[PDB]
Each structure stands twice: as C-alpha cells, then as structure tokens.
Ligand binder design. Structure first.
Ligand code: CHL
Ligand code: CHL
Ligand code: CLA
Ligand code: CLA
Ligand code: CLA
Ligand code: CLA
Ligand code: CLA
Ligand code: CLA
Ligand code: CLA
Ligand SMILES: CC1=C(/C=C/C(C)=C/C=C/C(C)=C/C=C/C=C(C)/C=C/C=C(C)/C=C/C2=C(C)CCCC2(C)C)C(C)(C)CCC1
Lengths: 96, 73, 31, 194, 225, 35, 158, 96
C-alpha cells in the first residue's frame, strides 16, 4: 500500500558477510604493484599497526595510511552497495 | 541585492523554507506567530535604497576622514 | 581640570529625570 | 488612610490591606497580583535583616568592638572557608524551612513593617556615610551634632547629588498633581510591565 | 513513529530447568527455626519486619564475608584495614587489588579511582538500589513488590526459584545467611582480639591446631594484658 | 570615581542590557494579541 | 517484487510531506520519539531539565576553546561564564516565546500515525512552556557548571 | 470514512484530513526517576511562573552588568581595562 515499509533496509546478514569478505579476500590477494607482492589489505594493516603503536598521535599528513584507507574503503563500500543492489534486485523481478 | 532581485523569487524561497521548518523534527515545536513572507515591492525598494545610501555615506565618510587625517591629522 | 564626580552624577540624575519626562511624553503621544 | 504624600492616589491593587500600605509603588513592582505576596515577604526579610544589622552595628560601635566594616578581618576561631560552609549549610536549611512555610501560607504586623523599613534606610545610611566620610555611625552622629549646620550629607562629597535628589522629591508630587488634574490617569503602561 | 507492539518471544540466556528440591523433607533440623514455621528458640520475635531484616543482614554479611575472604586470599590485606587504602588522599593504591586483573582501576600514572569519585558513584548507585528495594523512592518494577526480600522476577534470571522447590531454597538461603552473619561476627571479634585478618587467623589455627586458639591468645591477653 | 567606573558599566548597559530588554519588550507588545 | 521505498505521509499523497528512510525509518523514529521534546506525557519541566542540561553542557565548549581567553589559564572559567550568559539569553528567548506563541485556540486536534486520538502536549501551552523554561534554566546552569567541573576534573581533558 | 480506498477526506476525521499527525510524540507518563523529578521540581519551584523568570532575568542582567563594569572586566584582563601603558604618538601637522 502507500504506507511506509519499516523493513526498507532489508538488511541481510548473508549480504553483509558476502560483501565484506568478498572485498577483504581480493584486497588480501597478492598485488605485484605493491612491494614484496603485498596486498592492499596487507599494506593497509601494516600502516594501521604502525600508527596504533602511537595511539593518541594521529598518522602524519604524509603517511601512506590515508591513500590505502581511501582505496580500500571505496572498494569495500562498492562491494556493499552493489551486493545489496544485486541481491535485492535478483530477489525482485529486475533480472529474472 | 534588494534593488536588483525582486519579490517572487524570494517569496517562493520563503515558501520552501516554511515547508522545511514545518517538516523539520525538533524545530516544528517552535512556530512563528506571523506568517513569514518576502518583503513587499515598495518595502524592498526602500530597504535597498536605504542600504545603498547608508553604504554610500559610510564609505565616503570613512574615505574623506581617513585620507585627510592620514595626510594632515 | 577634569569634571568632579559630583558634577557628573548630578548631570546624570538630571538626565534620568529628563528621561522620565521623555517617557511621560511618549506615553501621552501613544494615547 | 494617609498615603505617601498628602494628595497621593493609592494604586488600585494597594487598598490598605497589607501592613504598612501607604499606596507607594510608582514603578508598579507589586502590580502583578501573584508576585505581590512574594514582594511583601521580600520586604519583611530585608527589613528583618536590616534591623538585626542595625542592632549589631550600633551595639558593636558603642561597646568599643572593631568597626563594622573592619569586623571581617578580625581573628576568629574558624577560618573563612569553614565559616562560609557553616553559613551555607545552616542558612540553606533554615531558608528551605522558611520557603516551605511560605508555600503553606494588624498592630504588631504594621510595627514590624515600619521598623524594618526604618532599618533598611538606616543601614543604607550607615554604608553611605562610611563610604563618603569614613566615619562610623556614632562618630558620624557626634560629628554632625558637633557642627550641625555645615557637617551633613548635602555638604559632603555627594552633596550636590543629594540636593538634586531632594529637589526631585520635593517637586515630584506637584507634577503628579498636574498629571492628575490635566491628564486622565488612564495609563495603559506600567514602569515595570511584569 | 507508529506503534509496532510486536511479540518479543525472547527466552532467558540461561533458564534453569525444573530441578525441584535437593534437600530432605525436614528443612530446619538445626537449632532454632525459620520464621513462619515455629517458635523462636531464645530471642523473642521482635516484629514481622525482623524476618526480612534477618534476610537483608544475611545477604549483606554473606557478601561481606566472601569479600574479606577473597581480598585476603588475593592481596593479603585484612578487610578491616582495606578501608585505609582508598581515602580522599592516595586512593590510587586501591586500584590494583584483584589477582589476574587484566587492567587496573588506576591506569599507570595520574589515572585513578578517586575516593570522592568512587564515593559519589557509591552513594548514587547503592543508595538508589537500597531505596528502590524499600519503600523509599518508588517502584521502577511494578511486577515486583517493594519490601519483599524474595521478589523473584528479573532478580532470578536463571530461574532457580521456580526450577526447584521455592521454600527449601528459601530456608537454605536463610541458613547460609545466619551462618555468614555469625561468621562475620567471629571475623570482627578476631580482628579486635588478634589484629590480624580472617584468613591469617585461619592459617594460624590450621598450621598448629592445638595452639593458636581463643585461649592461646587469651594467655597473652589478646595483646592487651 | 566616575571616569574609571561609569564607561565599563554603561557601555554594556546601553549595548547589551538595554537592547535585550527593549527587543524583548517590543516583541512581547508586537506579538501581543489585539484582545 | 519491485518494492518502492518512498511513500506519502501516512499514505495520504495530498499532504505536504513524504515518508522516507530519513523520516520514517524505525531507528530514526525510535531515537526522535525517545528524545525529551517528544515525551508529551512527561511534565514539561523535566523535559526542559534534560534539554537544558544537554544544551548548556555542550554550548560552553566553543567559548572555552575558541573564546578570547582560550590561551589564558582562565580559558575554562571564561568559557563557562559565557555559556551561562548564553543560557540566560536563551531563557529570555524562551520566556518571550512562551508569552507570545500560545495565544490561539488551535481547535484542531492531534492523532498518531496509527490514528489514535491523543491529548495535546502540555508543553505546547503558556504555563507549560513557562514550566519548560524554568526547567531549561535550571538544567542549563547545572550543565554549564558540570562542564566547568569536568574541564577542571576530567583526566584526559587538555 | 478516512480509511476507505482512495479516500483522504473525512469531516469526522478532520485531523487525518488536514494532516495534523503526531509524528514522533510519545504519551508515556513517566520516563525519569521520581525523586530526580522531585529534586528538579524543587530546584525550579519559584521559576515555573513566567513573570518570576522575567524578574530573575532583569535582576541577573543588572548584577552581571554591574559586576562586569566593576570587577568582571578587570578580572578577565581585558585590554580595554588595562591602560595604554605606552608612549603616545602625534598625528600629522604635529597634532597630538
Ligand atoms: C550582609 C553581608 C555582608 C556584607 C555587607 C559584607 C561587606 C563587607 N565584607 Mg564581608 N560582608 C558580608 C558577609 C560576610 N563577609 C565575611 C567575611 C569577610 C572578611 C573576612 C572580610 C570582609 C570584608 C568586607 C568588605 C568588603 C571588602 C565589606 C565591609 C573585609 C573587610 O572590610 O574587613 C577589613 C574583610 O577583611 N568580609 C563573611 C564570613 C564568611 C560573611 C558572611 O556572610
Ligand atoms: C581475564 C583474566 C583474568 C584471570 C586469569 C584472573 C584470575 C583470577 N582472578 Mg581476577 N582474573 C582475571 C581478570 C580479572 N579479575 C578481576 C577481578 C577479580 C576479583 C574481584 C576476583 C578475582 C579473582 C581471581 C582468581 C579466581 C580463580 C577462580 O575462581 C584468579 C587468581 C578472585 C580472587 O581473588 O579469589 C581469591 C576474586 O575474588 N579477580 C577483574 C575485574 C573485573 C578482571 C578483569 O580483567
Ligand atoms: C564491486 C562490486 C560488485 C559489482 C560491480 C557487482 C556486479 C554485478 N552484480 Mg553483484 N554482488 C556483489 C558485488 C558486486 N556485484 C556482492 C558482494 C554480492 C553479494 C552480496 C553480489 C550479489 C549479487 C547477486 C545476487 C546478483 C548480482 C548481480 C550482478 C550483476 C548485475 C548488475 C548489478 O547489480 O550491478 C551493476 C554492475 C555493473 C558492472 C554495471 C555498470 C557499473 C559501472 C561500470 C560503474 C561501476 C564502478 C565499479 C563497480 C568500480 C567500483 C570502485 C569504486 C571506486 C568506484 C553485475 C555483474 C546479478 C546478476 O545478474 O549477476 C549474475 C545478481 O543476480 N550480484
Ligand atoms: C544623545 C546624546 C548622547 C550620545 C549620543 C551619547 C553617547 C555616549 N555616551 Mg553619553 N551622555 C549623554 C548624552 C549622550 N551620550 C548625556 C546627556 C549624559 C548625561 C550627562 C551622558 C552621560 C554619559 C556617561 C556618564 C557615560 C556616557 C557614555 C556614552 C557612550 C556609550 C554608552 C552609552 O550609551 O551610555 C550612555 C549612558 C546613559 C546613562 C544614557 C545617556 C543618554 C542621554 C541622556 C539620552 C539620550 C537619548 C537619545 C536622544 C534618544 C534615544 C532614542 C533612540 C534614538 C535610541 C557613548 C559615547 C559612557 C562612555 O563614555 O563610555 C565610553 C559613560 O560612561 N554618557
Ligand atoms: C579512539 C579514537 C581516537 C582518539 C581518542 C583520538 C584522539 C586524538 N587524535 Mg586521532 N584519529 C582517530 C581516532 C582517535 N583519535 C581516527 C579514527 C583517525 C583517522 C581519521 C584519527 C586521525 C587523527 C589525526 C590525523 C590526528 C589525530 C589527532 C588526535 C589528537 C587531537 C587526539 C589525541 C591529532 C594529533 O596527533 O594531535 C596533535 C592529528 O594530527 N587523529
Ligand atoms: C545581622 C545580624 C548580625 C550579624 C551578621 C552579626 C555579625 C557579627 N557580630 Mg553582631 N550582633 C547582632 C547581630 C549581628 N551580628 C545583634 C542583634 C547583637 C546584639 C550583636 C552583638 C554583637 C557583639 C557584642 C559582638 C558582635 C560580634 C559580631 C561578629 C562575630 C559573630 C560571631 O562570632 C560578626 C561581625 C562580635 C565581634 O567580633 O565584633 C565585631 C562582638 O563582640 N555582635
Ligand atoms: C542482625 C541480624 C539478625 C536479625 C535481624 C535476626 C532476626 C531474627 N532471627 Mg536470626 N540469627 C542471627 C541474627 C539475626 N537474627 C544470627 C547471627 C544467627 C546465628 C547465631 C541467627 C540465628 C537464628 C535462629 C536459629 C533463629 C533466628 C530467629 C530470628 C527471628 C527471631 C528473633 C528476633 O526477632 O529478635 C532479633 C533480636 C536480636 C538480633 C538481638 C540480639 C542481640 C545480641 C546481643 C547479638 C548482638 C551481636 C553482636 C554481639 C553486636 C556487636 C556490636 C559491635 C559494636 C561489637 C528474627 C527474624 C528465630 C526465628 O526465626 O524464630 C522463628 C530462630 O529460630 N535466627
Ligand atoms: C549461598 C547463598 C544463597 C542462596 C542459597 C540463595 C538462594 C536463593 N536466593 Mg538469594 N542472594 C544471595 C545468596 C543466596 N541466595 C546473595 C549473596 C544475594 C545478594 C547478591 C542474594 C539476592 C537475592 C535476590 C535479590 C533474590 C534471591 C533469590 C533467591 C532464590 C533463588 C535464586 C538463587 O539464588 O538461586 C540459588 C543460587 C545459588 C545457590 C548459587 C550461588 C552461587 C553463585 C553461582 C555465586 C533462593 C531462595 C530470589 C528469590 O528468592 O525469589 C523468589 C530473589 O529475588 N536472592
Ligand atoms: C562461624 C563461627 C566461627 C568460626 C568458624 C570461628 C573460627 C575461628 N575463630 Mg572465631 N569467633 C566467633 C566465631 C567463629 N570463629 C565468635 C562468635 C566469636 C566471639 C565470641 C569469636 C571470637 C574469636 C577470638 C577471640 C579468636 C577466634 C579464633 C578463631 C580460630 C580458632 C578457633 C577457636 O578458638 O574457636 C573460636 C570459637 C569461639 C570463640 C566460639 C564462640 C561461639 C559463641 C578459628 C579460625 C582465634 C584466632 O584468631 O585463632 C588464631 C581467636 O583468638 N575467634
Ligand atoms: C544604580 C547605580 C548604577 C546605575 C545607575 C544608572 C543605570 C543610571 C542611569 C541613568 C539613565 C538611564 C539616564 C537616562 C536618561 C535618558 C534620556 C534623557 C532619554 C531620553 C529619550 C528621549 C528624549 C526620547 C524621546 C522620544 C523617542 C525618540 C521615542 C518616542 C518619542 C520621544 C520624543 C518621547 C551604577 C551601576 C552605575 C553604580 C551604582 C548605582
């Protein structure tokens, strides 16, 4: 009807896990562009560890954590948004 | 601003603002006693003329006093 | 020679009376 | 009944019911009905404290004890912090009790009222005389009685101020008489609107 | 906002299954009797309220006895001197008093339990609960009755009361209560007489049982004669 | 003494206190219903 | 099957509003409904208390950290006195709003989105707004004082 | 009836017709602890009246302005209260 649906989110645990881990695993795969074939997740976690030793002191403006954070979170959120879109569209009649 | 832009753009803008305030949570608790409307045509012509004249006089007063006092005290 | 404090306060009290009279005139005008 | 000057007009909310009611409220502070009992009780309290203060100042001055303005600096058994803590606690408790009693709720009443009124005037006089001349109340009285003609408020440092204020007081009721006989006395505004 | 008012249908994280009574049919073969089941052997029954007073002192003295026991076992500090640790001054020490504590109440440095801070929290928490238990304040849980020492609603999340026999559990608690109160009295008298903690007195009494008794310390006058 | 005292009192009186009371009062009157 | 999320207000498509995940989401609705302003059955004074406490607590901080005396050791005391002054001004604003706003009858009632007829908020009245203003004043001054206390007390404050 | 199909006008249900809906309001009678409520009732005992608040704010205005002009400004070490404490300068044409 024309009443608002309180289940607008349609939050699916399987979507959450699929998107999170299906971005983490590819981002944890070897990447020959990074040194020692390190992954984006690997270098990002390395920067997190290095900056968490100095917990109150934030990362320096020149520290590579920012670029890794952006280039990892974009892909993560892309996986989350597109996974929700694809799952809810397949559940509905958008595809078949 | 008051001289060039005229009432009817501002009236519609205020109408959208009325809608926004009426539909904002925690702000609809407070309601205007007088319906907010744009400045009338004559009123705004006057307001713009007053601003024009005030800025005119104050700018020139500042200039004529500051330059003359800086060069002569 | 600066003005004495008694001079300033006397003039200020005269001003307060003048202000009272101005309020009386304003109320009378508003009628 | 006699009002605050011969020819005055008492405000309609001042009909002589309250003790000491002389129809004096030019600024209409007690015009609001609900705050008028509060203002009565504020008068009674300020009067009572001024009465106690006048007694404790005059007796202290006449018994050779330290001057009332100097009495704080005297060496007492208890320091400032503990004394103010004592004061805060006990006066808070007593004023809580007074507030709750007030929330619950002739000759002698009028007497008390007048006495408090005189006290508040007398205390203001003592503070002003000290601030202007630096003389305690009994010393100020002795100085006045020694040379009554030239030693007075109106010949002190604030003399012209006092002369102007007394002129204003003396010329106020004449202007009020003109206002009554010429105007209609139909003011829609009050000097303190609330 | 619309009214949902759906069915929660939640179950307890733990809900003890019916286990009934684990005691004999006789319930107080010990000296005296539980209130409401016979005549007081010695002291007169002061008032109906006294039963509930006994329960509250009992539960509090249980908690106090276990606290003195665990504090002396974990730190060696006697309970009667543990108060001197947290004071308006130097309450930092009281922090690291729990064996195995992953972290201190007082992180290294200034970071610390202040006496007044602790105290202010203590008043605001314990007094609130104390009042809510009794007729003071109001009843935040209408389903429970203020002035009842055995509410048994939200206060038994595991549901042992309903899982077993309620009244045998009640008398079991009462016996534990009286035992712990008498033990607490023994602890205070031992503290007064020997100036050493309860577990210290225990250890002295078990290392050489024949000595290190009341009468052994009395031979020295309890350090006062 | 006037010079050291009166400016520091009357500038806030005329530029913060009197404006506040005047605006509040005028507001209360203007929004006051006719009846 | 081809679910549409955005719907008209309460299903009426002729009112100036639309129900969206920002307006009618369950989490948003529960948060707003639990705020003191929307507790219409509670006394206006106590709602004003919490309001004042929250508002006076935070509003002090800008004056502490960005006021004229932020560099001086008296930065906190200045900021808290600024916050108290702002609380007094807002109390004046509340008093005048309460005097002027509630002068009309408002004959039309109010209902919930479920259609349950409910009484008007006692806050939305002259005396109710006066009680709310008093609660605001007490709460704001208590919150300003608490902010002062916490700036003088809190361990990791700087 | 307002609840009928495609009907949004009802002279009996004027509130639903005109849209006067309580969106987030809740009519629960109690949310705070009662004694906390009593304390804050007593803390604002005399201030529940609007004219009492008017007197409070007028007195507060007077006391704050007096204290600021007497003691508050100097205590805050305002530059205006501090004297110039510097040698003076002469304008052009030797005009002091
Ligand atoms: C009606 C109340 C009241 C009044 C008018 C004054 C007035 C004064 N006191 Mg205060 N005081 C008051 C209450 C109190 N004083 C003090 C403690 C002091 C001290 C210790 C001193 C003053 C002093 C002063 C002067 C300000 C400088 C002035 C005479 C000073 C003064 O002039 O003494 C030389 C001073 O040294 N007062 C206490 C104790 C907690 C009070 C309790 O309510
Ligand atoms: C997570 C690791 C950790 C470990 C291994 C221990 C281990 C111990 N603690 Mg500690 N604690 C730990 C964390 C903590 N303890 C405490 C607070 C306490 C208390 C209050 C007590 C213990 C007690 C005990 C002992 C209980 C043995 C059984 O039963 C044991 C030596 C008990 C004890 O001292 O028995 C004598 C006891 O009473 N611990 C806190 C704060 C809540 C902890 C938080 O991390
Ligand atoms: C980066 C993540 C991503 C992408 C691009 C896709 C892509 C796709 N999914 Mg989805 N999916 C994902 C993650 C993703 N999936 C995850 C994590 C899950 C598990 C929750 C699913 C579950 C799922 C289901 C169940 C279904 C799909 C389907 C589809 C296809 C149909 C169209 C669609 O929904 O997307 C739009 C995608 C396009 C590629 C269109 C063009 C988009 C342009 C090029 C912009 C995109 C930018 C790009 C993603 C880069 C992102 C980085 C960022 C920095 C910008 C498409 C190939 C459906 C299908 O038919 O597949 C067989 C289907 O039924 N997906
Ligand atoms: C219209 C004339 C006028 C003007 C423009 C000023 C302007 C000023 N005076 Mg001065 N003053 C005047 C008349 C005037 N005064 C008179 C007649 C007296 C009595 C002798 C004073 C006594 C006085 C003192 C004692 C002090 C000032 C101060 C000030 C300054 C700001 C604070 C303030 O407003 O307090 C003014 C204080 C008052 C008590 C009000 C006095 C104003 C007069 C009597 C009424 C004027 C009303 C006006 C015509 C109509 C107003 C209605 C509408 C247009 C707004 C400012 C430079 C202070 C200062 O120097 O700060 C640095 C200060 O300490 N004034
Ligand atoms: C637990 C959370 C936490 C805490 C307590 C602080 C606390 C602080 N941060 Mg950090 N910070 C955090 C999370 C946190 N930050 C996160 C998630 C980020 C990434 C966006 C940063 C990024 C960051 C930077 C880049 C900087 C700080 C700085 C600071 C200090 C100001 C202060 C000590 C600054 C600092 O070092 O203090 C001078 C600083 O330059 N923070
Ligand atoms: C307003 C009431 C009031 C107040 C605030 C004081 C306050 C004071 N009196 Mg006063 N006094 C009062 C009423 C008051 N008295 C009355 C009614 C009598 C009678 C006295 C008789 C009196 C004597 C005889 C003395 C004081 C003294 C004092 C001081 C010490 C109080 C103690 O100790 C203190 C300044 C003593 C003092 O130190 O002298 C200043 C002292 O010797 N007072
Ligand atoms: C303060 C705790 C406390 C309380 C409130 C009660 C209350 C009760 N008990 Mg319990 N009981 C307690 C302690 C207590 N007892 C302890 C410690 C024991 C174990 C020894 C028992 C053993 C016990 C039995 C076996 C029975 C009761 C019974 C009763 C009830 C009847 C007695 C009565 O009303 O008078 C209460 C009067 C007193 C408590 C006063 C006695 C005071 C003496 C002198 C002891 C003081 C202790 C200590 C020396 C103080 C030190 C002070 C310090 C400064 C040094 C009543 C519910 C009987 C019952 O339920 O009847 C049906 C019953 O059969 N109780
Ligand atoms: C060994 C002591 C002991 C015993 C036998 C009991 C026994 C009982 N209590 Mg009591 N109680 C005790 C200590 C004890 N309690 C203490 C120290 C406190 C304070 C924290 C309480 C506070 C308390 C409340 C507030 C309530 C009970 C209730 C109950 C009943 C069922 C729940 C329960 O505890 O199951 C028995 C559980 C155990 C024996 C396990 C103890 C060991 C754990 C794991 C540590 C039962 C009569 C409820 C009741 O009677 O309602 C009908 C009730 O409402 N008790
Ligand atoms: C649950 C009860 C209980 C228990 C298990 C103990 C156990 C103990 N007590 Mg304590 N004690 C108690 C109650 C208790 N007491 C009471 C009620 C009192 C006061 C009358 C005392 C007064 C007391 C003193 C003064 C001393 C002990 C000592 C001791 C130890 C030696 C045993 C002894 O001499 O008998 C003690 C038994 C009684 C005195 C019976 C009293 C019953 C009426 C032992 C750890 C001694 C110690 O510290 O050992 C080194 C010691 O000096 N107790
Ligand atoms: C208590 C005290 C104080 C204070 C005081 C004061 C506050 C004073 C004041 C005084 C004053 C406050 C004065 C005033 C005056 C005024 C005037 C003088 C005015 C005038 C006006 C006018 C003239 C106007 C007119 C008009 C208008 C414009 C409007 C309408 C119309 C008319 C025409 C009416 C101090 C703190 C310092 C110190 C201590 C003591």
């Amino acid at each position: 009807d024309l009443k608002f649906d309180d289940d607008w989110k349609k939050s699916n645990v399987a979507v959450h896990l699929a998107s999170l881990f299906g971005w983490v695993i590819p981002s944890a795969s070897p990447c020959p562009a990074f040194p020692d074939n390190a992954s984006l997740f690997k270098v990002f976690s390395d920067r997190i560890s290095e900056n968490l030793a100095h917990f109150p002191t934030g990362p320096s403006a020149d520290d590579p954590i920012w670029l890794y954070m952006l280039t990892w979170h974009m892909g993560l959120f892309a996986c989350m948004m597109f996974g929700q879109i694809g799952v809810q569209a397949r559940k509905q009649g958008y595809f078949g | 601003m008051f001289l060039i832009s005229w009432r009817g753009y501002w009236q519609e803008l205020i109408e959208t603002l009325v809608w926004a305030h009426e539909r904002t949570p925690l702000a609809n608790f407070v309601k205007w006693n007088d319906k907010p409307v744009a400045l009338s045509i004559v009123q705004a012509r006057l307001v713009g003329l007053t601003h024009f004249a005030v800025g005119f006089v104050l700018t020139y007063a500042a200039f004529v006093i500051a330059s003359t006092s800086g060069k002569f005290g | 020679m600066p003005l004495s404090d008694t001079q300033v306060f006397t003039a200020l009290f005269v001003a307060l009376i003048t202000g009272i009279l101005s309020l009386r005139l304003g109320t009378q005008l508003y009628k | 009944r006699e009002l605050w000057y011969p020819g005055a007009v008492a405000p309609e909310y001042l009909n002589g019911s309250m003790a000491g009611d002389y129809g004096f409220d030019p600024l209409r502070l007690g015009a609001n009905v609900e705050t008028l009992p509060y203002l009565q009780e504020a008068e009674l309290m300020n009067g009572r404290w001024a009465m106690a203060a006048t007694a404790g100042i005059l007796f202290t001055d006449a018994t050779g004890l330290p001057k009332w303005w100097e009495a704080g600096a005297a060496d007492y058994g208890y320091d400032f912090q503990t004394l103010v803590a004592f004061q805060v606690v006990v006066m808070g408790v007593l004023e809580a009790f007074r507030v709750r009693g007030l929330m619950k709720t002739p000759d002698k009443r009028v007497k008390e009222v007048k006495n408090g009124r005189l006290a508040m005037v007398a205390f203001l006089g003592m503070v002003s005389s000290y601030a202007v001349t630096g003389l305690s109340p009994l010393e100020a009285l002795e100085a006045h009685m020694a040379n009554p003609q030239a030693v007075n408020l109106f010949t002190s440092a604030v003399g012209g101020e006092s002369v102007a204020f007394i002129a204003f007081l003396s010329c106020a009721p004449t202007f009020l008489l003109a206002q009554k006989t010429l105007g209609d006395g139909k003011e829609e505004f009050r000097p303190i609107p609330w | 906002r619309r009214t949902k008012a759906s069915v929660p249908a939640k179950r307890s994280a733990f809900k003890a299954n019916k286990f009934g009574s684990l005691a004999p049919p006789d319930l107080y073969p010990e000296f005296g009797t539980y209130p409401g089941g016979g005549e007081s052997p010695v002291i007169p029954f002061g008032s109906e309220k006294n039963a509930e007073r006994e329960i509250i002192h009992g539960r509090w003295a249980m908690l106090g006895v276990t606290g003195a026991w665990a504090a002396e076992n974990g730190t060696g500090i006697p309970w009667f001197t543990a108060g001197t640790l947290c004071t308006p001054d130097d309450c930092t020490a009281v922090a690291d008093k729990f064996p195995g504590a992953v972290a201190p109440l007082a992180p290294a440095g200034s970071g610390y339990p202040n006496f007044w801070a602790v105290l202010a929290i203590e008043i605001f928490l314990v007094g609130s609960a104390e009042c809510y238990r009794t007729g003071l304040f109001e009843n935040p849980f209408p389903e429970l009755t203020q002035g009842d020492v055995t509410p048994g609603g939200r206060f038994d999340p595991l549901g042992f009361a309903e899982a077993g026999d309620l009244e045998e559990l009640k008398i079991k608690e009462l016996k534990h209560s009286r035992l712990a109160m008498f033990a607490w009295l023994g602890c205070i008298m031992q503290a007064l007489a020997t100036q050493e903690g309860p577990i210290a007195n225990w250890t002295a009494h078990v290392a050489d049982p024949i000595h290190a008794n009341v009468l052994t310390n009395a031979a020295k006058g309890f350090k006062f004669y | 003494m006037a010079a050291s005292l009166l400016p520091s009192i009357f500038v806030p009186l005329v530029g913060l206190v009197f404006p506040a009371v005047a605006m509040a009062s005028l507001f209360l009157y203007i929004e006051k219903e006719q009846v | 099957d081809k679910v549409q999320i955005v719907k008209p207000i309460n299903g009426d498509p002729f009112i100036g509003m639309l129900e969206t995940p920002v307006t009618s989401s369950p989490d948003v609705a529960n948060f707003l409904s639990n705020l003191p302003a929307y507790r219409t059955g509670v006394a206006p004074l106590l709602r004003g208390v919490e309001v004042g406490l929250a508002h006076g607590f935070f509003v002090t901080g800008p004056f502490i950290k960005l006021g004229p005396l932020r560099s001086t050791d008296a930065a906190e005391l200045a900021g808290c006195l600024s916050g108290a002054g702002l609380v007094l001004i807002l109390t004046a604003c509340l008093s005048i709003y309460g005097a002027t706003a509630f002068q009309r009858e408002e004959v039309v009632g109010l209902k919930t989105l479920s259609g349950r007829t409910i009484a008007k908020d006692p806050l939305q009245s002259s005396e109710g707004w006066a009680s709310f203003t008093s609660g605001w004043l007490v709460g704001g001054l208590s919150g300003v004082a608490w902010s002062y206390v916490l700036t003088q007390v809190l361990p990791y404050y700087s | 009836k307002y609840g009928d199909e495609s009907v949004y006008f009802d002279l009996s249900d004027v509130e639903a017709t005109t849209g006067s809906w309580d969106v987030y309001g809740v009519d629960s009678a109690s949310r705070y602890p009662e004694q906390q409520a009593a304390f804050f009732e007593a803390a604002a005992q005399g201030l529940g009246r609007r004219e009492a608040v008017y007197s409070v704010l007028a007195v507060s205005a007077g006391l704050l302005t007096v204290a600021y002009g007497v003691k508050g400004a100097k205590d805050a070490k305002l530059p205006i209260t501090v004297g110039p404490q510097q040698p003076a300068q002469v304008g052009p044409r030797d005009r002091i």
